[PDB]
Amino acid sequence: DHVLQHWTVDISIDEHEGLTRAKARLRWREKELVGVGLARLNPADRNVPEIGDELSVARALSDLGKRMLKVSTHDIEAVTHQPARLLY
Amino acid sequence: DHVLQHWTVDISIDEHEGLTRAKARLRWREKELVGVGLARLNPADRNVPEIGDELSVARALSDLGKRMLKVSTHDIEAVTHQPARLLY
């Protein structure tokens, strides 16, 4: 009675000179998105690169989810033929 | 000069009787999070399950990113020994 699926987000993390850039790619059906996030270390945490990693990724995933809400909106509008906007 | 990493988010999608539930799991270093999202179809799009899929996943990824911002906050606070809060 349930229909189950499994998807994957691929995340790249690039640390360079205290700047960490994350890119989170998701492909599904007819769509593909990349969420992007940045985190820069400061003197107080410059020796804790794990913070830059997880913060840039948090941002990339949030960006990805935001972009996906927009795709969802476009698909709903295609069905209803009425403008829509999803806030959450 | 760059340090590169690659991480993966695992997403489950469960459709049942018009309700779609997505769970997005990320493990990294010393942490593990699951973001959760729901989408329920309505009569106007009940025959477009792809909308429930992508909307529940958008929500799960947004939830995951929000939870990860909180983990990042805790880690920053552990370094600075000062309360913090990351809005984005």
Question: Resolution in angstroms, to 1 decimal, for this deposition?
Answer: 1.5
Looking up tokens 């830059």, which residue turns up?
A: A52
Question: Domain for residue A40, yes or no?
Answer: yes
Domain that holds residue A28: 9-88
How large is the angle between the packed helices A49-80 and B49-80, nearest 10 degrees? 160
Question: Domain for residue B1, yes or no?
Answer: no
Question: Domain for residue B40, yes or no?
Answer: yes
Residues in chain A: 88
Q: Give the phi and the psi of residue B40 in degrees, each rounded to 5.
A: -115, 130
Per CB-CB distance under 8 Å, the chain A contacts of B42 are none
Question: Domain for residue A1, yes or no?
Answer: no
Question: Domain for residue B17, yes or no?
Answer: yes
**Residue A34: Cβ-neighbour burial (10 angstroms; 0-12, 13-18, 19+):** middle
DSSP category for residue B20: E
Looking up tokens 């106007």, which residue turns up?
A: B44
Q: Give the phi and the psi of residue B42 in degrees, each rounded to 5.
A: -120, 175
Looking up tokens 């806030």, which residue turns up?
A: A87
Task: Provide the experimental method for this PDB entry.
Answer: X-ray
Give the 3-state secondary structure of residue A32. strand
**Region for residue A9 given its phi and psi (left: phi exceeds 0; alpha: psi -120 to 50; beta: otherwise):** beta
Question: Domain for residue B29, yes or no?
Answer: yes
Closest CA to B88 of A83, A55, A42: A55
Per CB-CB distance under 8 Å, the chain B contacts of A38 are none
Question: Domain for residue B84, yes or no?
Answer: yes
Give the 3-state secondary structure of residue A87. coil
B41: which 2 tokens? 């179809």
Per CB-CB distance under 8 Å, the chain A contacts of B7 are 11, 13, 57
Q: In chain B, positions 2-41, which contact chain A (CB-CB < 8 Å)? A: 2-17, 24, 26, 28-29, 31, 35
DSSP category for residue A82: S
Give the 3-state secondary structure of residue A56. helix
Asked whether the CA dihedral A41, A33, A73, B20 is positive or negative, the reply is negative
For residue A64, the domain's CATH number is 3.30.160.240
Are the CB atoms for B66 and A37 separated by under 8 Å? no
A4: which 2 tokens? 């189950």
Domain count, chain A: 1
Task: Work out whether strand B3-16 and strand A3-16 pair parallel, antiparallel, or are unpaired.
Answer: antiparallel
Check B16 against A1: CB less than 8 A apart: yes
Question: Domain for residue A2, yes or no?
Answer: no
| Alpha-carbon dihedral A10, A12, A13, A14, rounded to 10 degrees | 180
Are the CB atoms for A34 and B61 separated by under 8 Å? no
A26: which 2 tokens? 């998701």
Q: In whole angstroms, what is the distance from residue B60 CA to residue B12 CA?
A: 10
Q: In chain B, positions 36-65, which contact chain A (CB-CB < 8 Å)? A: 44-45, 48-51, 53-55, 57-65
CA A82 to chain centroid: 27
Q: How far is A51 from chain B (nearest CA, A)?
A: 6
